[PDB]
């Protein structure tokens, strides 16, 4: 890959839509206003980081509860 | 587990949006503290106050 310092490409090119809450170690919420996909999940069973659908069903409630 | 350590035990209350690279929201619903920031300037990760007003707006924007 192009190193970060040089890349103008939004980090998330594509999202995945079938990530279950139970397999998520954390969601990383990137501070990238200019890009459509800001949410990256780190997964528990494989430790991949996958960009996820921000409309995934469980995401909103998971985020709101973190803040209570 | 009684074994299980919550990754965040203490938080910073004075972190502003501009000094954050990203937030990590830890899937540890059991724990009081679930919010981590990687800092630009430092590159340290710190746990941050979850009642920080800007955190809400930050997360809502990410969801659109
Ligand atoms: O809607 C959810 O966030 C959710 C639904 C499911 O019961 C489960 O996810 S799964 O469909 O991927 O299996 C998960 O629910 C619970 C879950 O039992 C625990 N979280 S998890 O291990 O990461 O999956 C539990 O401690 O909290 C989840 C619900 O959130 S809560 O508000 O803290 O109770 O997620
Ligand atoms: O905008 C960002 O904050 C960011 C963008 C990159 O896509 C990401 O790459 S990475 O997650 O594979 O490393 C970058 O690096 C961070 C990342 O937030 C964290 N990884 S984690 O430990 O699983 O959460 C971070 O804590 O470590 C990475 C730093 O990379 S490094 O400088 O080359 O060592 O985050």
UniProtKB/Swiss-Prot annotation, chain B:
The record marks 22 as: Important for dimer formation. Changing residue 24 to S: 55-fold reduction in binding affinity for Link domain of TNFAIP6. Changing residue 13 to A: No effect on anti-HIV-1 and chemotactic activities. Changing residue 38 to A: No effect on CXCR4 activation. It comes from the Eukaryota. Heparin binds at residues 17-27, 38, 45, 61. Changing residue 24 to A: Impaired CXCR4 activation. Changing residue 21 to S: 55-fold reduction in binding affinity for Link domain of TNFAIP6. Disulfide bonds join 6-31, 8-47. Changing residue 22 to S: 55-fold reduction in binding affinity for Link domain of TNFAIP6. The record marks 21, 24, 40 as: Important for integrin interaction and activation. Residues 15-17, 24-26, 36-46 are annotated as: Receptor binding. Residues 5-9 are annotated as: Receptor and heparin binding. Changing residue 44 to Q: Slightly impaired CXCR4 activation and clear resistance to inhibition by heparin. This is SDF-1-alpha(3-67). It comes from Homo sapiens (Human). The chain holds residues 25 to 88 of 93 of the full protein.
């Amino acid at each position: 890959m192009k190193p970060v310092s040089l890349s103008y490409r939004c980090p998330c090119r594509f999202f995945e839509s079938h990530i279950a809450r139970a397999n998520v170690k954390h969601l990383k919420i990137l501070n990238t206003p200019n890009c459509a996909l800001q949410i990256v999940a780190r997964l528990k069973n494989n430790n991949r980081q996958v960009c996820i659908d921000p409309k995934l069903k469980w995401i909103q409630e998971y985020l709101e509860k973190a803040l209570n």
